[PDB]
Design a binder for this molecule. Structure first.
Ligand code: HEM
Lengths: 499, 499, 499, 499
C-alpha cells in the first residue's frame, strides 16, 4: 500500500482490532456522554460553565506546548542499545564497558541547529547526535554532533554565536549580516565553517552521518589512572550527503525528510547502527601535544592518536508517542558515570551547566523523572525532595538530610572523581589566538578533494553574497589567511554575484 | 519512646532492619563519591562549576517550593476508604453507591482557610474537609468544609472576601478593618459569621468535626430521574472543640496540633470515621422552598428534609511522603461522575471552574497525572495530549482526533448529563437582599442556648472591637437586624472594650 | 545597497550617531571587563562557578524560548491605528466609534495556523488577522481570519480538528489520513474547505488579503438597543493570491516571505490599509434567517445584509523588537468594551474562555501586564493582586476587596452587558446537521468561475489522494452532496492520481 | 486612634481625597457594570462561560501565589538609603563609596529562616538582613544574617541542614531528631548553635539587631590592589532580645510582631539605623591567620582586626504594596559591583550560583526586570534577549550578538576581576575537622557571663531533650569538647528533663 509512517493509524487500528474501543473520559476519569456538542441553554443559547467536559479538554489544549530547545528544536528520535564488542577496561572502569557483550539500553535524538520546530530537515546546518545510555551507574549522556569540532572554544561566545545563526531581533528574518559579521570577527570558526559548507553540511538523513563526542573527555580505570580521549561512532550505513539542490527542493517537498527516513528505516526491520571508537591520549601526550588538546576547534589526528574500537550502537525501536518520548528528551552532558569525566574544554566546562539548567526551564525542575529521562537501569536514592510536578513517592518517608544516623543512602568512595593538579593564576585567559588556520588548511588541501573544494567555496559565496561588502572582505581575509586560493576562489565568486 | 509521630525515622530505620543503605546518587543516577566536600581548586581555592554533584543537588533544593494553595494552605491529609451502607440507588446511579458493602478508595485533606503554610491549626476559621473517591467512573471530588453554609452566595465576591480575610496589601498584617468592613457591607455573611464565632469556629482537631458538601447538588438515577441533595458526613468520634483559651495556647505550643493529632490517631490504629448522610429535595419542593434552594448561606431544615444514611468514611492510612501525597493533592468539585451533578448554586458554579484552573498553575498543566491525583481506578482515554511534565505514555500513538475511523475512545451516551429547563433573561440577577436574617435568627435563638450566645458575642466583639468605630456601628446594626438582643449584646461589649 | 529589511542593523548603527556604546553589563548592571574568555584556573584548567558573568548570561540564554502559540505559531506583526470614516453610533456606543476622526491606536498580527515557529508563510492555510484596539474602555481584540467562516461550529471539536491538521502523535509527520478523515466525518467544514483549496488558499503576503471577525457579534448603542453584526475589513492593496507553484518556490526560497513583505512595505513608507464594514442584523431578521445566524460555518449574503463602511485600518510602524512586541502579543476575543458584545455563536463562546486561558500559560498569569498587552489608554484599576512576575506597583496600598468603604475602584453601571431572554432546556444540542451544503453549492457554481472552479478541484485531489481509499470516497460523497459535478471532477482526478 | 500600621486604609482614603473612585475595569481595561452579581440564565440558573468579568477576576485570584522563599520565607521589608560617612577608597573602589556624603538608594528585607510564610516572627532562628544597593555600577546585594558565622562551612551540607531544620518528610512536623542528629554529626556547627541558643536567638524586632556579611569578601582599589574583609553593620537602636516567655507569647499574640514593629517605627518617622564597618585583612595576614580565613564558621577577632566606619544605613520608607516590593525582592550575592569581589569561602562560593538560580524559579527567568529588582540606577545593556514575561523593549532591535560591527554594548577592562593565584590537586578537600571548638570555647567563657551560660544551656537542653537518648549522648559529647562544663550543664538539665 504505502510507507509505514503513512500507515501509522491504519496499523494502530489493525493491531487494536477485535477490541471494544475505550470509553472517552475526562482528565479525572469521568466518562463523557457526548463530546461533540457543547452544553448550552437552548439550541441557539450561550455556553454554560456547567460544561466541565468542555473546559477539561480546552484547558489542556490551551497548554499542550512547552518551549522548544533553544537550539536543535527540529529533531527526530529513536531507541536501541549499545553492545560492547571490545575491551577498553584498561581505560575506563565504567560499568557500561564492563564486559564484551554488555547490552545497555539507549535513546537517541538527531536534530538540526538554528531552525525552529517547524523548519525543514535537509538544510545546511550541523547535525545533533544525542545518545543517552541508561547504565547501572546512572545515565550517561553523550551529547554529540555529526562533526568533531565547533565554531567556538569559549562558552561566553556560544549564546552570541547562536543569535547570529538565528533570526534578527527586529525583522525576525535570517540575517547574513549577523551570520558573517560574527564569523568574520571570529576566525577560529574557520575549521568548522569549512566542514559545514562542505559536502557533509547536508547529510542524506540521520543514518548517513557520523557521531562525534566532539569534546575531549577523561577516562578513569579501576586503578585511578586517568587519560583523555575523543568519542567516535561511525555510520554502518556509510556517509551519504544531499546535493545543494536535491536538498533544496526536499526542503519544501518534505521538510520532515529526516523524520520520515529514520522512521520507516526502523519500521521495516532495517535498523541502522554505529560503531563506537575512542582516541586515547595520555596526560604526557596532552602535555607535549601541539595546540591545546582541549580546543574544540581542533581535532586529534588518527595518525598520531588512532581510533580504537569500543562497541556498537543499534537503533531498533521507534518512539510510540513522539512528544512524550522524543520532544521531552533531556540529555545532560553532565551525566557521566564513574570511569568518565569532563575535561578542561572551556566549551565543555560550560555545557556542564547550560544543559541541566535549561532542562529545568524547558521541561521543569523534576524532568529526570519524565519516563524517558529517568535513570531506570540504576537506582535514584538521595536527599532531594519535592519540587513542582513531583512524580513517584518523593522517596517516601526517608530521612532527608546527610549525614544522618537513620540508614539513609550512603556514599561510594569508589565513585570519587579522579583528581588533577592545576596551577596558574585564576583569570580569563584569552583564547582567540590558538591557530584558527593550521588544521583548517590541512582539511582544504589534504582532506578536501579538488571537487569538494569547488562546491565549498561556491557554497560559502552563495550565502556570503548577501552580506555587506565590508563584511565580505573580512570573511575573505580569513579564508585567504587559510590559503590564498581559498579566499581568492571564494572572492572571485563574490564579484559575479555582485552583478 | 514517644508518640508515633516523634519516632518517624526510628521506625523507618527499624523498617529496613538488616537491609543495606542504598547508594547516594545524583538526579541522573550517577553514584556519588563524597557528598560532604565541594570540589575546589586547592583546600582554600574557589569552587568548580565542574562540581556537578553540588550543582545537581543545589539546583534542586532551589526549586523544592511550589505555590501554596491560594486558600486552605495549612492542611493535613490521610487516606482510607468509603463503604456503602444503605441503598440510595433510587436517587443516584453513581457507581460509588452501586451496592451495599462496596468499598471505594478515598483521600482526604483537612485545613484552615486564611493562614499561610506556616500558620497555626487551632485558630478560629472554617475548616476544609475535602474528599476524593477513586471510583470506576473517574474520580469524584466532594470538596466540603466543616460548615454547611458560607459567608457569601455569589462567586464574584469570593476573591474579595478571601482578600479581606488575609493580609493588608501594604502592611502585610491582618486588618480587622478589612475583615469587618467586608462583612459589614455584605450581611449575607451573618449566618456563617454566627456559626464561625460560635464554639465550632475552633474544632478540637480534624477528627471531631462534621464534613458538609454545603452546596446543593443534583442526583440522577438510572431512569434519568433527578433530585437535589445535600451531603453530610458526621464525625463518629463525636463533636469536640477547643476553647479560645487552650486554642491560643496550642497555637504557640503546637501550631501543627491538627496534623500531629490526625497522624497519631491513625498510626495507633485509632481510625477516625464519618457517617455519610444525605438530604433529598425533589424538584417540586425546591420550587416552593421559602428561600433560594441554591443559596449557600441557607440550610435545609432536618425537619422537612431528613438526613439519609449512605455509608461510612474511614481513614486508616497516613501519607508516606506528605508533599507527594498531601501537598500536591488536588480536589476539583467539577470531578463528579455519572449519577452526581451540580445545582445552579451560584457559588458552586464558580467553583466548577476555579479549582481545576488554579491546579493548572499551582501544580501544573498535567496535575491529573500526579499519583495522588490520577483516577487510577478508571481508564482515562481521551483526545488530550502533551503539555509540560507529561508522564505515562501520552496515550501512545493513538488517533488524537475525534471523531475518527480508527477505533480511538468513543463517547458513552449513558453518561449524558440530566437535562433541566431554565427560562429567564440572561443577566446579572441581584441576590444581595435574598433574606440574610431569618435562618440566622433561628441559629441565634433556637440552635444556641444562653451560655453560647454569650460566648458568641464575646468572640465576635473581641475581634470586632478593633475595627474603626464607623465599621462597628454598621456591623452591630447588622446583628440587631437578626435580633435586637444580638446587636445590643455586642454593642455592650464594644462599649466596654473601647475603654 | 539592499532592502530596508536586510539593512536592519545597518540603520541601527547609523542612527546610533557617533555616541559611544553603552557599557556591556550583566542583568544586575555590574559592568563586564571581559565576556569572551571564561574565568578559568590556569590557561588549560576547569571553569569557576565564580564566573557569574558567564553563569548570568548562560542562564538567561537557557530560557529565551517560551511555548509558541498552540495554533498560529508563525506570524508577523505591526502597529498603527484605526480611524472612523462613517458614523455608526446609531448602532454601537463603543468609545472607539465615538465620532468621525477618532484615531484609536492598533496592533495587528498576521499568521498561518498549523505551521510551527519554523514553518514557512507561502503555503495553503487560512491566515490570522488579529487586531488589538487600545481604546478608552480597555482593549478590544478583534481576533479574525482571512475568511468569514470556519471548518467547524462547536468548540468541542476545535482541538480535535487542530490535531488532525498537525503532526501524527507517533511519526510527527503531517498526515493526510488525519486531515481528511476528520473533514470526511464532519461535512460541516465543506464551506471553509472549499475556500482553503480555492485561490484564496494562499495570499500574496498579508497586505493583499481580507480580514474578518468571522463570528456574529453584538452591538449596543448608548440607548440600550442591540443588533447583531459581522465585521469585514477589506484590503486596500487589493486581493492577490499565489500559484501553487510560486507558493512552494517561495516556501523554500524564502520561508519567511510574508514576514518581510510586510516589513519592507512599511519601511518603504508604503503602509498597508483595510476598510472596516459591518453587516447589521436586527433580532427580528435573526429569528427569520434561513439558517442559524450564529453558525460559524455560514455567511450573511451581501444582498440581504450590505456592508456599512465604518473606518480605516492603517499599519505604519514596524516592531522594534519582534519577540517583545509580536511573539509576546496576546489577543483576547473576550476583550470587548461597552457597546460590543459576543453572540451565542458556540465557537465564539468557547473562544471567550480559551484565548485568555492559553495566555496565562504561554506568557504568564500577569501577561496583560506585558507592555504590548497592557491597555495603556485605559485606567486599569481593580481588586486583582499579585501573581508571578507581578510588574507595575501591583496597585499600591489600595483596598483589595469589593465592596469597600475606603474609596477603592467603583463599578460603572453604565456599561452593564445587554439583556437578552433565553428560554429552553440546558443540554448539548446537536448542530452537526445544520446544513453543510447549500451555501457551499452557491459558492461553487456562483461565487467561483469555471476557470478557478477547476483549479479548486485540483488543489483538493492533490491532497485527498494521499488518504486511504475508504477515506477518499466519504470525502467525495460530501463534495458530491454539494453538487455531483463537484465530487465527480475531484473523483476523476483521484482515479488518475491513483494510477 | 489606633497604630499607623492599623490605619493603613484610613490614610490611603483621605490621601485619595475627595477624588472619585476609578472605574472598576477587567484586566483588559473594560469597565465592569456590576462586579457583584454573576451572569446567569434566570435568577436561579447556570453560570455562563460568557461572564468574562468573572473569569477575568477569578483566574487571577487562582494564580495569586508564587513559591515562597525556600528559606527565610517569613520577612518584612523597607527601603531607604546608604550614606558615605567615611573614605574607605584606599581599600575598595566601589562607586558606592566614591565620596563621603554620596547617597545610595537601598532596599532591605529582614526574616527568620525555617518557618513558612504564615509562621511567627518571634521564634528562635537566625535573622536575615539583606541589603540591596542600587548603584551606578549595577546592583550590590549584601545578603547577610544577624550572625557573623554559620552552622556549616561547605555548601554541600546546606540543603541537608535546611532539611533537618524544617519539617519531617512524612509527618510534616518539626523533628528534634532531624535537628540534633545533624548538628551532632557536624560539630563545626557548634559555634552558631551556641550563638543561636543564646539571648541573640530571638532579637526584639529587626531594629534591635546587628547585620553581618558573614563571609570574607574582597576589596579592590584603584591600583588593582585587593584586600579580604568582613562587613559589619551594627545597630544604632541597640541590642534588644526577647525572653522565651515573651517571644513564645508574641508567637500567638502577634506572629507578625517584627513586621508591624518596623512598619510603625518607620511610619512615625522613627527610622531605624545601622553603621557599617569592615574588617580589612591582607593576603599575607590571611596566610598567617591561625584558621581558614574563609571558614564561614569563624570570626576575625576585633583585636587583630579593628572595625573601620564606612557609612550609614537608614530605612525611611515602608513598602506601598508588600508583595510587589517585598515578597518579590530578590538578593543575589553575586551582584557585587566592581570594587567588591567574593572570597574562596566554600560557603559563599555556592551562594554565587544558588540565589539567582532559585530566583529564576521562584520569581521567573526575567526577574531582574521586576521594578524592585531592576538596577534602575545603572543601565542594563548587553546581549541577553527574550525569555518569558519580557518587560521593557528587550533592547529593541539593537544587535544581539557579540562582538559585532554595529556599535553595540562594549567591554570594560576597568571592571575586570582582580586576579589571584591558587595551586593544588583540584579535589574535594575534607573540611570537616577544621577545629570546631576553639572559637566556641572563647565565646562560651569570655563572651558569655554566668547567667547567660545558664540560659544558653537551658535553651538548648529544653529542645535537645526531645531527641533520642543516643543523639543527646552524641550531642553532649560535642558540647564538652568545647568545654567540660558546657557538656555537664546541658547534660545535667537533660537527666532532669528526662524526668
Ligand atoms: C551557603 C548557603 C546558602 C544558600 C545556598 C542560601 C540559599 C538561599 C535561598 C535559595 C534563599 C531564598 C532566595 C529567594 O527566594 O529570594 C535565601 C534567602 C536568604 N538568605 Fe540563605 N543561603 C545560604 C546561606 C545564608 C547565609 C549564611 C546568610 C546570611 C549571611 C543568608 C541570608 C539570607 C537572607 C537574608 C535571605 C532572605 C532574602 C530576602 O529577604 O529576599 N543565607 N538563601
Amino acid at each position: 500500500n504505502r510507507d509505514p509512517a503513512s500507515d501509522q493509524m491504519k496499523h494502530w487500528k489493525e493491531q487494536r482490532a477485535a477490541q471494544k474501543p475505550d470509553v472517552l473520559t475526562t482528565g479525572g476519569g469521568n466518562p463523557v456522554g457526548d463530546k461533540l456538542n457543547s452544553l448550552t441553554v437552548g439550541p441557539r443559547g450561550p455556553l454554560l460553565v456547567q460544561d466541565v467536559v468542555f473546559t477539561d479538554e480546552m484547558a489542556h489544549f490551551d497548554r499542550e506546548r512547552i518551549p522548544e530547545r533553544v537550539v536543535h528544536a527540529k529533531g527526530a528520535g529513536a531507541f536501541g542499545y549499545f553492545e560492547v564488542t571490545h575491551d577498553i577496561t584498561r581505560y575506563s572502569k565504567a560499568k557500561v564497558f564492563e564486559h564484551i557483550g554488555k547490552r545497555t539500553p539507549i535513546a537517541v535524538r538527531f536534530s538540526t541547529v538554528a531552525g525552529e520546530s517547524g523548519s525543514a530537515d535537509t538544510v545546511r546546518d550541523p547535525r545533533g547526535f544525542a545518545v543517552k545510555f541508561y547504565t547501572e551507574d546512572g545515565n550517561w549522556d553523550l551529547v554529540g554532533n555529526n562533526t568533531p569540532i565547533f565554531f567556538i572554544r569559549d562558552a561566553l561566545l556560544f549564546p552570541s554565536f547562536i543569535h547570529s545563526q538565528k533570526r534578527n531581533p527586529q525583522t525576525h528574518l535570517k540575517d547574513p549580516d549577523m551570520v558573517w559579521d560574527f564569523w568574520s570577527l571570529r576566525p577560529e570558526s574557520l575549521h568548522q565553517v569549512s566542514f559545514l559548507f562542505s559536502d557533509r553540511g547536508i547529510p542524506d538523513g540521520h543514518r548517513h552521518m557520523d557521531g562525534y563526542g566532539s569534546h575531549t573527555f577523561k577516562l578513569v580505570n579501576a586503578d585511578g589512572e586517568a587519560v583523555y580521549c575523543k568519542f567516535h561512532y561511525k555510520t554502518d550505513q556509510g556517509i551519504k550527503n544531499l546535493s545543494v539542490e536535491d536538498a533544496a527542493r526536499l526542503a519544501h517537498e518534505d521538510p520532515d525528510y529526516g523524520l520520515r527516513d529514520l522512521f520507516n528505516a526502523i519500521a521495516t526491520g532495517n535498523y541502522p547502527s554505529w560503531t563506537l571508537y575512542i582516541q586515547v591520549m595520555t596526560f604526557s601526550e596532552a602535555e607535549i601535544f601541539p595546540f591545546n588538546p582541549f580546543d574544540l576547534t581542533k581535532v586529534w589526528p588518527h595518525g598520531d592518536y588512532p581510533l580504537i574500537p569500543v562497541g556498537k550502537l543499534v537503533l531498533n525501536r521507534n518512539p510510540v508517542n513522539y512528544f512524550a518520548e522524543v520532544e521531552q528528551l533531556a540529555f545532560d552532558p553532565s551525566n557521566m558515570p564513574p570511569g568518565i569525566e569532563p575535561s578542561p574544554d572551556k566549551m565543555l566546562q560550560g555545557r556542564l551547566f547550560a544543559y541541566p539548567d535549561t532542562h529545568r526551564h524547558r521541561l521543569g525542575p523534576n524532568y529526570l523523572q519524565i519516563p524517558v529521562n529517568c535513570p531506570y537501569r540504576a537506582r535514584v536514592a538521595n536527599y532531594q525532595r519535592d519540587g513542582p510536578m513531583c512524580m513517584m513517592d518523593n522517596q517516601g518517608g526517608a530521612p532527608n538530610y546527610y549525614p544522618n544516623s537513620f540508614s539513609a543512602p550512603e556514599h561510594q568512595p569508589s565513585a570519587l572523581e579522579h583528581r588533577t593538579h592545576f596551577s596558574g593564576d585564576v583569570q580569563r585567559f584569552n583564547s582567540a589566538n590558538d591557530d584558527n588556520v593550521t588544521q583548517v588548511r590541512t582539511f582544504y588541501l589534504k582532506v578536501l578533494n579538488e571537487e569538494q573544494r569547488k562546491r565549498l567555496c561556491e557554497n560559502i559565496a552563495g550565502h556570503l553574497k548577501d552580506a555587506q561588502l565590508f563584511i565580505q572582505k573580512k570573511a575573505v581575509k580569513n579564508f585567504s589567511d587559510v590559503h590564498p586560493e581559498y579566499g581568492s576562489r571564494i572572492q572571485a565568486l563574490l564579484d559575479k554575484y555582485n552583478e
